[PDB]
Amino acid sequence: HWGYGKHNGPEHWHKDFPIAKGERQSPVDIDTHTAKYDPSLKPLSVSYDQATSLRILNNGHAFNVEFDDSQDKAVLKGGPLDGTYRLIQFHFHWGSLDGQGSEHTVDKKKYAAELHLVHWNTKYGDFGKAVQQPDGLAVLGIFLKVGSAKPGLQKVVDVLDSIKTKGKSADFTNFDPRGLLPESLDYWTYPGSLTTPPLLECVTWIVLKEPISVSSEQVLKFRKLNFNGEGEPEELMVDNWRPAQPLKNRQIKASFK
Numbered sequence: 001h002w003g004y005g006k007h008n009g010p011e012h013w014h015k016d017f018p019i020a021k022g023e024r025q026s027p028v029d030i031d032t033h034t035a036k037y038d039p040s041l042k043p044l045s046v047s048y049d050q051a052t053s054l055r056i057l058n059n060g061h062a063f064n065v066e067f068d069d070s071q072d073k074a075v076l077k078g079g080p081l082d083g084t085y086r087l088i089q090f091h092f093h094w095g096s097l098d099g100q101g102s103e104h105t106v107d108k109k110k111y112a113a114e115l116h117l118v119h120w121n122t123k124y125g126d127f128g129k130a131v132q133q134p135d136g137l138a139v140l141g142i143f144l145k146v147g148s149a150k151p152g153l154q155k156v157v158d159v160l161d162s163i164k165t166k167g168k169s170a171d172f173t174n175f176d177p178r179g180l181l182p183e184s185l186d187y188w189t190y191p192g193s194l195t196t197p198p199l200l201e202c203v204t205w206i207v208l209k210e211p212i213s214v215s216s217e218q219v220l221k222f223r224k225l226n227f228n229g230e231g232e233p234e235e236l237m238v239d240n241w242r243p244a245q246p247l248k249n250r251q252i253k254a255s256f257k
């Protein structure tokens with residue numbers, strides 16, 4: 001039932017999922033007066049060499065690139081829990097115009113889109129057991145701003161034409177997610193939640209300081225997707241983002257000065 005419409009969007013989710021009003025919900029605004037530099041934070045490193053992409057899918061509220069997460073060398077490492085996190089999936093959230101679309105904000109600034117690279121902490125065995133733990137997932141969040149094109153994004157935005165409607169799936173092998181990363185891996189981190197139902201508070205959020213630049217042509221391709229299935233009335237897939245939630249007692253930590 002849940003979606004991003006007026007009558008089933010973020011403001012409605014709490015009715016089915018009471019945790020929507022919990023103590024560790026995401027996304028949040030990152031106020032740069034209040035993030036505390038933490039010299040103990042382990043810097044991020046990626047081993048995406050053997051990351052093995054499988055397929056890309058339109059599930060009716062986003063598109064997901066699925067990975068073979070049995071590749072034990074394809075991991076994100078570091079962060080507050082010094083974790084080793086298996087890459088399993090990535091997806092985006094975006095807006096109906098360039099001035100909005102991101103889920104996290106920085107000093108209340110919204111970006112055009114946000115990329116979420118989803119990983120599960122290997123010490124919990126599989127993604128299913130991981131989402132039961134407060135630090136079970138590491139989601140690497142990366143802001144998208146409009147400017148020059150991102151060459152590593154081209155394979156992603158171009159295949160979207162093949163999965164325009166809900167339910168469409170396409171083989172998507174040999175995609176290298178290193179092509180989606182900015183130069184710097186300086187980051188903010190805080191304990192939070194999935195930003196869609198079931199809104200489980202199982203995420204160590206790692207949000208990169210540096211946005212990637214993508215072209216207007218690239219972002220437009222996001223907005224050609226459909227929420228609806230083939231033959232149904234056309235509803236363009238836009239504004240599939242949850243707004244910032246109460247920070248409550250949490251401290252946002254910065255890896256950088």
Ligand SMILES: CC1(C)OC(c2ccc(S(N)(=O)=O)cc2)=C(c2cccc(F)c2)C1=O
Pocket residue numbers: 088089116118119120127128131139193194195196197198200
């Ligand atoms: C249904 C349930 C629990 O929700 C999510 C989910 C993940 C990330 C986000 S988000 N937007 O990044 O916070 C929101 C939701 C997954 C999931 C998806 C891909 C890989 C994985 F290991 C788990 C689930 O299995």
Ligand SMILES: [Zn+2]
Pocket residue numbers: 091092093116195
């Ligand atoms: Zn997401």
